TrEMBL record, chain A:
Source lineage: Eukaryota, Sar, Alveolata, Apicomplexa, Conoidasida
Taxonomic source organism: Toxoplasma gondii (strain ATCC 50611 / Me49)
Protein name: Filamin/ABP280 repeat-containing protein
Automatic annotation (TrEMBL), chain B:
Protein name (record): B-box zinc finger domain-containing protein
Segment forming the signal sequence: none
Included stretch of the parent chain: 440 to 488 of 1073
Coiled coil: none
Superkingdom of this protein's organism: Eukaryota
TrEMBL record, chain C:
Covered range of the whole protein: 1950 to 2109 of 2777
Name listed for the protein in its UniProt record: Filamin/ABP280 repeat-containing protein
TrEMBL record, chain E:
Covered range of the whole protein: 353 to 453 of 603
Name of the protein described by the UniProt record: Zinc finger protein
All residue ranges annotated as the B box-type domain in the record: 1-29
Coiled-coil intervals, chain numbering: 58-83
Amino acid sequence: VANPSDSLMTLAEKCHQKWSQTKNPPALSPYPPFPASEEAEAILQRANLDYDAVVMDTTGEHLRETTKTLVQYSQDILNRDSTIQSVLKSLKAHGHVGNVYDAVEKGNRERLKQYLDVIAQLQAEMDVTYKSIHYG
Amino acid sequence: YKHKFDLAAANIFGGAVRVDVDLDSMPAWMSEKFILQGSFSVTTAPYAV
Amino acid sequence: NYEEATSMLWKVQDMADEKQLKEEVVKVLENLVRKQLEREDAQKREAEEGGCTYLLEETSKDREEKRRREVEEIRSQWEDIHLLRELLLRLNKNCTDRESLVHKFTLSMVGRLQLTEMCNLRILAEHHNMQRLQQENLMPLAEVLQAQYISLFRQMTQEI
Amino acid sequence: ISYEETKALARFKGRGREYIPPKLTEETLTLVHHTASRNPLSP
Amino acid sequence: RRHPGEVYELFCSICHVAVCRLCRGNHLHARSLMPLNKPYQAVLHMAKKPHFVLAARRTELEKRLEEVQKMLDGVRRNCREEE
């Protein structure tokens, strides 16, 4: 309540920080078929692999891990919305404090106007009396 | 030290004053109005069994 | 006027906070969870299904149709992953833009506050200067000079 | 403005963050005037 | 004080502290920097009076002097009229 300035400053700082740490959603994988069984056996044949071997597809594992990571990214989006609403409330409060400060400033300004016009009158009358003494 | 004076009074004295007093944080003891009636008198009288 | 200024932030934020994409993403995530669930369900069910049989021969056609259905199911799984990914990326874009609006307003309001406070400092300093001025120089001067002019009236009157 | 503003707003002039300008620093007494013009008729 | 030798020149106004010629580089808001004679006089007058947050309860609990007092002499009147 001393300097809404510095407080909102730290607030927007936290903002920048988190805001900018970008996070990229999980990537997409080859349309299921790939590498296409028909072609896999060809690869497993032009390799001259000693031990006889089979082609164990894993597409499913990759796909469900992607499900989990996308779920996590949606949770991240929710957290983001929540933090945004929090920063909005913080701004509301700091803005009330700032309207207070702006009123204070306008008031000090009008007071300065008053004192200045008053001293103007005073110095005018002082010149008057000094010249009048010079005459007397 | 003026900025430290600002932060001092905002951290030793920034919270609301906890000396709340109207009539109700006080217990029910502070709502009574004592009165005291009676009459003393000296008499030269017997005891009247 | 920061109170009907941050009220416009609160207004603009939630009305550029499009509800449709978010309900859509909720529904699609629910659907994909239900899908993995029925997937494990089919696993156990086909387990018990082979458990019986063992003498009811599986015809060639059956096995061909089974390979085909398996490729089609991996394909549908990729499809749903893609849909969820797209919706989530769109939601990320909208959220990032809302965050940009918010940070802009914050910094702009921060700067406005700095300006108000600095004007306070300057005007308050000038006040100090002028008040000191009068209470010393100006005031002394005025009083002593009025005393002198009164003495002058006195002498001129004693004269006439 | 005076010295106060022309030193802190012109030597720096809104620039900042890597510049750093350099360091800051007979024949006794008679009340009669002995006249400069030596014409005896000059006063 | 964070390095000797040369004198202060400007003012910070976010964290209220004097700024030297080498100091604005580590100041993140560098603008909001003013010369350092005017801030001084302003702070002088300001302090000169009672401080603002100090005047929050230089006017808040002075009514709480009176709220406690109007009941304190209330008990005084009750006990005195019984004495």
